[PDB]
Design a protein around this motif. Structure first.
Motif, PDB file in Angstrom:
ATOM      1  N   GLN A  51       0.822  -1.212   0.000  1.00 56.69           N
ATOM      2  CA  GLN A  51       0.000   0.000   0.000  1.00 56.69           C
ATOM      3  C   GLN A  51       0.860   1.267   0.000  1.00 56.69           C
ATOM      4  N   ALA A  52       1.935   1.280   0.775  1.00 51.91           N
ATOM      5  CA  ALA A  52       2.809   2.452   0.815  1.00 51.91           C
ATOM      6  C   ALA A  52       3.372   2.761  -0.562  1.00 51.91           C
ATOM      7  N   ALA A  53       3.714   1.713  -1.304  1.00 51.37           N
ATOM      8  CA  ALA A  53       4.278   1.876  -2.639  1.00 51.37           C
ATOM      9  C   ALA A  53       3.305   2.590  -3.574  1.00 51.37           C
ATOM     10  N   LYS A  54       2.007   2.402  -3.353  1.00 47.65           N
ATOM     11  CA  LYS A  54       0.997   3.054  -4.191  1.00 47.65           C
ATOM     12  C   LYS A  54       0.993   4.571  -4.021  1.00 47.65           C
TER      13      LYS A  54
ATOM     14  N   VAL B  44      -6.202   4.002   0.002  1.00 50.49           N
ATOM     15  CA  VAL B  44      -4.880   3.592   0.491  1.00 50.49           C
ATOM     16  C   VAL B  44      -4.615   4.039   1.929  1.00 50.49           C
ATOM     17  N   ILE B  45      -4.909   5.306   2.226  1.00 47.79           N
ATOM     18  CA  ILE B  45      -4.752   5.822   3.582  1.00 47.79           C
ATOM     19  C   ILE B  45      -5.556   4.998   4.602  1.00 47.79           C
ATOM     20  N   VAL B  65       0.895   5.524  11.922  1.00 44.00           N
ATOM     21  CA  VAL B  65       1.629   5.086  10.745  1.00 44.00           C
ATOM     22  C   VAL B  65       2.339   6.274  10.096  1.00 44.00           C
ATOM     23  N   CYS B  66       3.635   6.133   9.837  1.00 48.03           N
ATOM     24  CA  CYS B  66       4.397   7.154   9.127  1.00 48.03           C
ATOM     25  C   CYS B  66       4.933   6.580   7.819  1.00 48.03           C
ATOM     26  N   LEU B  67       4.908   7.382   6.770  1.00 43.91           N
ATOM     27  CA  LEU B  67       5.497   6.999   5.498  1.00 43.91           C
ATOM     28  C   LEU B  67       6.518   8.063   5.182  1.00 43.91           C
TER      29      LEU B  67
END
Lengths: 90, 90
Positions: A51-54, B44-45, B65-67
């Motif tokens: 999901q992060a990659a999206k 996605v979030i 959650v951190c990206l």
């Protein structure tokens, strides 16, 4: 040289702050784990990474995912094709 | 007092480091957004937040959650029932 994932997981766990580590492929296959991260966590870890990659277009701009709670922090990142999650306390 | 989400999103964007904000319910419904975060990011979030929650048992120990990537950082957390994502540059 001849290196194995099992060796690398053992090496990683020698860090006194690391209490768990788990590696998956892009579909949640558990490639190997130690400590607090186990079979039940592999699917979730893989979904988080996918999901992060999206949320990005490259070049090779793969977002690192961090999770923080009372039970510590988990950092999830891709390395050489596989998804690696590391759990540290705090 | 009478407060609206729209007002709160406007307030949040006044922070010069914040370039996007988006709120969802637990199934990805876009409750409102500004800046870099838009309709295409809500699903996605929400999935990120819901998956992170699976990596804990309470009490109320909801993981943040951190990206992080070249395009900045996104922090996702629940507040008063809804999922809130904030994008800052760096």
């Amino acid at each position: 040289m001849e290196a194995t994932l099992e060796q690398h997981l053992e090496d990683t766990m020698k860090n006194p702050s690391i209490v768990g580590v788990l590696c998956t492929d892009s579909q949640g296959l558990n490639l190997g784990c130690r400590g607090t991260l186990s079979d039940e966590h592999a699917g979730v870890i893989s979904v988080l990474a996918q999901q992060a990659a999206k949320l990005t277009s490259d070049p090779t701009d793969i977002p690192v995912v961090c999770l923080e709670s009372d039970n510590g922090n988990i950092m999830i990142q891709k390395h050489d094709g596989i998804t690696v999650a590391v759990h540290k306390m705090a």
